[PDB]
Amino acid sequence: KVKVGIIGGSGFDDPNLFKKVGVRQVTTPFGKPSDTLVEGFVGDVACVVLPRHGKGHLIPPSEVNYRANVWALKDLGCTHILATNACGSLQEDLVPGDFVVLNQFMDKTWGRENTFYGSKPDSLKGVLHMPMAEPFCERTRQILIQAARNKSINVYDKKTMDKSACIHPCVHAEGSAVTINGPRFSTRCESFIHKAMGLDIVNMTLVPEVSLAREAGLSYASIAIVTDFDCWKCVDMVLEQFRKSVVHVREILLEAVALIGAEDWTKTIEANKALVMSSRLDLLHQ
Amino acid sequence: KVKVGIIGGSGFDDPNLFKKVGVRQVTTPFGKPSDTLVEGFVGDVACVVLPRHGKGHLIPPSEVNYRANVWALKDLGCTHILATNACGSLQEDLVPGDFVVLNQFMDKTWGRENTFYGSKPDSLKGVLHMPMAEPFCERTRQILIQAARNKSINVYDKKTMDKSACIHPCVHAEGSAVTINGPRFSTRCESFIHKAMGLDIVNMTLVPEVSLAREAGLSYASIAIVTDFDCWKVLEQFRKSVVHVREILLEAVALIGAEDWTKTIEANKALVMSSRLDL
Amino acid sequence: KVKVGIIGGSGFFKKVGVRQVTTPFGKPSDTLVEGFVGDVACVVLPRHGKGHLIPPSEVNYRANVWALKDLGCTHILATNACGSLQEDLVPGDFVVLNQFMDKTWGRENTFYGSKPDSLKGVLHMPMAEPFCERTRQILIQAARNKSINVYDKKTMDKSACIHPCVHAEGSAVTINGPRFSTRCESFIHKAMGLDIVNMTLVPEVSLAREAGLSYASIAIVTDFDCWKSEEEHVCVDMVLEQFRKSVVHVREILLEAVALIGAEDWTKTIEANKALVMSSRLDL
Ligand SMILES: Nc1ncnc2c1ccn2[C@@H]1O[C@H](CO)[C@@H](O)[C@H]1O
Ligand SMILES: Nc1ncnc2c1ccn2[C@@H]1O[C@H](CO)[C@@H](O)[C@H]1O
Ligand SMILES: Nc1ncnc2c1ccn2[C@@H]1O[C@H](CO)[C@@H](O)[C@H]1O
């Protein structure tokens, strides 16, 4: 049986994706999650929603308790996490109103709790060195992309399509994010450096969320919402564009939950769990 | 109504820029500043001076309470902050004894309190996401540059002058800093990587000071003092640098007092309010 | 008189005894093994403790280095498992590093400061060439003496690279861990020109210089990180399997290096190490 957790970012502080059946006010061994967890169903598929920043968007990116959010969803029996992440574009073909189903990242965060494990008494016992070459659940990424196709949203894959298929607004079928600490936005100098490294978007919340999801044995995928060009490059139209983006992502998320529930995930879930065990350095040395 | 704060770095642990009127021992919601704050007048312009590292320079760059220093200057009524920052050059044209009126940076610091706002009880309530594309106050940058001209110090502007006009010692009219955490200096490998990224100087103290000044609604500009080439490639030179940076600061204070800042001060304050995402 | 400490990586003589020490900065990773190589006193310290329970970001580098300083060590030889970012550095090779790029954070990386849990002072140490060059060349000559190939990219051709070899120079990026790198990070580090990626070199190398000690690292290439094919992407089992095979050569190099160190006069080098610390004391 699957159960899909949803971590909603900017624009999803108070989602209302389904009829609320129950609420869970919980804590974890790592502290309090960002807010109450909301339980319900998309069709016959159990779903749990949590706003990354809390209902009033009072928690900044560096202070989000990523460990508690991921562990709370694990404790409720989630098998998957779908996340939204607002971002700035570093590249001309990613324009405000587009989305990116990320497959890669470069980490420039610091000072955040980014692992459940360690040698101190307040972390889980053991040492975990997780492979992160392709850090998302690929099967779940392809679900997000197919959900966009099913909801009549353009999909652009630069590996197989010419630039003529980059029709806006579109879901970019791959992409890399730099995660910065915030809360300040980047300088023009930083933006040009990240662009020169070949990164596609900049955001403040993907890491360590994606890392902790893999440590928890959960299938994780992010859909990033391009809200503007970062500073390497009217306001009423911007806010309206973001509103329309949120409507489209809500459509993608609900279709994605249905598509996840339509398939069997037994082997993928067992492989998620086995990857955690095989990454326990303290167990493999003995 | 303007009042100019001055944060003195290396070579400015005990500046004595003017006859002291008062000495302020203050606290802030973020702790105590690096030292007492000295207040007085330069001409008719009110001025406040604070040594970044304290009188004895006993506080290393990663342990400076940037939040307390900036907040204390704001509390005493400062509208502007002028800061000095010692640095190493990453570029052939920036030689020891030159100064740089910075306009950009790349941040490699960690573990420092870099914002006044958050969700924890030790910060002001709110989520503040400040634009930083051009992170300095441009009017105040141009004041530093005009102050150097008024004191007959060479200015080199790469966008409008040939390289043959780069006559040393000179004030470079623009430049980018990488801020590293310290206390160690860079390796040759790190210096070459920073150079290849296009950065001009390396220093340990610019960030988060520049960021917190904008959060506090203040106009901030830095003058960096090139002390040596960084290791991709002195005391007597630095003493002469301090003498001329002092002249620049004192002239810059006079020049700030010579204009109206009403709309810039208003814009500084409104930018903070418009950057509050929780509101 | 010289005395060589050895800080041992993942899978880590005439043993006299085992010693527990305390330090102003806490307890070292584990007890220390005291002995001799010939007539040269030697002390061995595992970086991660006996059960390998301490991850790289939580190793007490300050206590490990200071413990060896307090026992009278003049030299530290260190091993560090790593991933290769470059075609000619292959699993089973070794690198006598001469450079690094630091991406660690949150680790205690200096003995000095203004907080009560550090020594009083402000120490700004030069780090242009952050290793002891004399000791680096001892590690390379030790490999020659044990019939292990040495590859110098300054003087030799890729066609003349014979494996397993000790690479006579190289640069490391140190990441904080515990996770391995993404493919995107791996390619960015490769494009910066870095040779290997590891998690334990920094701040160990920096603190050794703060302590006035001669320090050199021999990195053990266990994998190609993750910039190559999917079957070559790093994981714990891959690191451990190659490490177990390479430690035999690393032991031979280290034991020979200790003998070579004890056969030379180090009076002025040691004086220079200490004088570098004193001249970096800005508060004085
Ligand atoms: N250009 C950018 N650089 C960094 N972060 C950005 C953007 C655009 C959006 N975000 C995300 O939105 C929030 C800040 O408004 C943050 O929560 C952040 O994740
Ligand atoms: N080459 C360099 N790299 C980094 N920092 C440098 C230099 C040269 C000067 N500084 C600044 O001066 C102090 C170090 O003595 C520190 O306070 C620092 O800001
Ligand atoms: N490809 C890689 N990236 C980062 N670190 C790596 C490797 C390969 C090995 N190591 C080092 O070995 C330990 C991880 O098990 C860690 O202690 C680490 O120092």
UniProtKB/TrEMBL annotation, chain C:
Cited PROSITE patterns: PNP_MTAP_2
Entry keywords, A to Z: Cytoplasm, Glycosyltransferase, Nucleus, Purine salvage, Transferase
Protein residues bound to adenine 1: 81, 223, 225
Disulfide feature: 226-235
Molecular functions per Gene Ontology: S-methyl-5-thioadenosine phosphorylase activity
UniProt catalytic activity: S-methyl-5'-thioadenosine + phosphate = 5-(methylsulfanyl)-alpha-D-ribose 1-phosphate + adenine
Entry keyword annotation includes Ligase: no
The keyword Nucleotide-binding is assigned to this record: no
Binding residue positions for phosphate: 10, 47-48, 200
Binding site for substrate: 199, 223-225
Site (Important for substrate specificity) residue list: 181, 236
Sequence positions that bind adenine 2: 223, 225
One of the Pfam families matching this protein, by short name: PNP_UDP_1
HAMAP family documented for this protein: MTAP (MF_01963)
Function: Catalyzes the reversible phosphorylation of S-methyl-5'-thioadenosine (MTA) to adenine and 5-methylthioribose-1-phosphate. Involved in the breakdown of MTA, a major by-product of polyamine biosynthesis. Responsible for the first step in the methionine salvage pathway after MTA has been generated from S-adenosylmethionine. Has broad substrate specificity with 6-aminopurine nucleosides as preferred substrates.
PANTHER family, alphabetized: S-METHYL-5'-THIOADENOSINE PHOSPHORYLASE
Subunit and interaction comment: Homotrimer.
Protein name: S-methyl-5'-thioadenosine phosphorylase
Species annotation: Schistosoma mansoni
Taxonomy of the source species: Eukaryota, Metazoa, Spiralia, Lophotrochozoa, Platyhelminthes
